[PDB]
Write an enzyme that holds these catalytic residues in place. Structure first.
Site, PDB file in Angstrom:
ATOM      1  N   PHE A 121       0.808  -1.389   0.052  1.00 50.14           N
ATOM      2  CA  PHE A 121      -0.109  -0.128   0.121  1.00 50.14           C
ATOM      3  C   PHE A 121       0.932   1.197   0.073  1.00 50.14           C
ATOM      4  CE2 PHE A 121       0.439   1.841   4.472  1.00 50.14           C
ATOM      5  CZ  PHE A 121       0.916   0.644   4.941  1.00 50.14           C
ATOM      6  N   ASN A 128      13.517  13.555   1.545  1.00 51.81           N
ATOM      7  CA  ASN A 128      12.577  13.671   0.326  1.00 51.81           C
ATOM      8  C   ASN A 128      11.369  13.319   0.957  1.00 51.81           C
ATOM      9  OD1 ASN A 128      13.628  11.329   0.757  1.00 51.81           O
ATOM     10  ND2 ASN A 128      12.803  10.323  -1.109  1.00 51.81           N
ATOM     11  N   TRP A 134       6.968   5.924  -7.594  1.00 51.53           N
ATOM     12  CA  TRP A 134       8.136   5.418  -7.224  1.00 51.53           C
ATOM     13  C   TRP A 134       7.898   3.699  -6.833  1.00 51.53           C
ATOM     14  CZ3 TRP A 134       9.663   3.543  -2.175  1.00 51.53           C
ATOM     15  CH2 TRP A 134      11.093   3.294  -1.924  1.00 51.53           C
ATOM     16  N   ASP A 165      -2.427  -1.722   8.134  1.00 50.92           N
ATOM     17  CA  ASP A 165      -2.562  -1.608   6.697  1.00 50.92           C
ATOM     18  C   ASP A 165      -4.053  -0.836   6.452  1.00 50.92           C
ATOM     19  OD1 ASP A 165      -3.283  -1.884   3.888  1.00 50.92           O
ATOM     20  OD2 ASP A 165      -3.442  -4.201   4.052  1.00 50.92           O
TER      21      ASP A 165
END
Length: 316
Positions: A133, A152, A162, A221
């Protein structure tokens, strides 16, 4: 586990350990009527990259082995991934996370004890499921690191792009690559995977029946947090897989989130050979002790980070 290009003869150092393989109840609810119920073995993987005495990158992955008679349903769940950013990076962290995650996916040297009532032999046929996720939190693993000058900070779309690039590079030839962005229309989701020929919209789990009997409940999650509510509120006997993903789009985590997405990939009927690979294995308590210490570290403070690294180097 990593290329020489990345480890410059010891300027870099890895923290990597697994928990001892531990039997757990299935993250996918199996009936009690269920015929041929599998045994579930869970292994926690923690990886950290060090540059001199500072942590720079962390990755936590949980592996679930649903052991049947002739095959294994193997779920690889990316729990957390984070950077510190105390130093100028110099490295594209995808070139580290990719190889490390691929190593964890393909690791098959677990020392699994026999189920009670010396080591258990795994079936060679294994069906892989990689479950990730994407949600742009500031500090997944390293508290107070969002304050660092060279960290970042993802937004939702850049973090998804990404992860798609990483997962695609380590799932070559897999049977499916699924992307779902709950709440987004099909055209918006399709845009992220237009240059990925093997990717399609949706999910990897059973499409029909009750959601609790198809979708695994992973710890921490966003998907799993809704599954937890369905079980607590006793809607588990009614909510279908279709209705679960429909209602998942309206949860606060998703509707108020920034491009919160769910990725799944499968490879079916992979013949695996057992190959022991001597790595550090710890008890669950030692694992949680490490994780609890890491949560108390001010990762904006080089003193506390170096102290944490020093204390781990003492404990080996």
């Amino acid at each position: 586990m990593l290329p020489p290009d990345i480890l410059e003869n010891g300027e870099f150092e890895t923290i990597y350990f697994q928990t001892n393989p531990t039997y757990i109840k299935s993250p996918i609810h199996i009936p009690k009527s269920t015929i041929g119920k599998p045994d579930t073995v869970k292994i926690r993987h923690f990886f950290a990259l060090l540059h001199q005495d500072l942590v720079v990158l962390g990755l936590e992955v949980f592996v679930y082995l649903q052991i049947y008679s002739d095959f294994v349903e193997k779920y690889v769940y990316v729990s957390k991934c984070d950077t510190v950013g105390l130093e100028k990076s110099t490295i594209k962290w995808g070139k580290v996370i990719g190889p490390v995650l691929q190593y964890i996916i393909n690791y098959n040297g677990y020392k699994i004890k026999m189920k009670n009532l010396e080591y258990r032999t795994l079936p060679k046929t294994q069906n892989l499921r990689l479950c990730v996720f994407t949600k742009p939190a500031k500090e997944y693993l390293f508290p107070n690191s969002a304050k660092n000058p060279y960290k970042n900070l993802w937004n939702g779309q850049s973090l998804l792009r990404w992860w798609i690039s990483i997962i695609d590079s380590i799932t070559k030839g897999w049977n499916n690559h699924k992307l779902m962005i709950p709440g987004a229309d099909k055209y918006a989701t399709r845009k992220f995977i237009e240059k990925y020929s093997d990717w399609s919209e949706g999910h990897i789990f059973k499409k029909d029946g009750l959601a609790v009997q198809a979708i695994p409940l992973f710890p921490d999650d966003p998907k799993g947090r809704f599954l937890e509510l369905v079980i607590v509120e006793c809607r588990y006997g009614k909510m279908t897989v279709s209705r679960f993903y429909q209602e998942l789009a309206y949860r606060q985590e998703f509707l108020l989130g920034d491009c919160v997405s769910l990725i799944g990939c499968c490879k079916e009927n992979l013949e695996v050979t057992y190959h022991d690979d001597l790595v550090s294995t710890v008890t669950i308590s030692e694992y949680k002790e490490f994780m609890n210490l890491l949560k108390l570290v001010d990762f904006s403070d080089r003193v506390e980070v170096s102290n944490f690294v020093s204390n781990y180097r003492k404990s080996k």
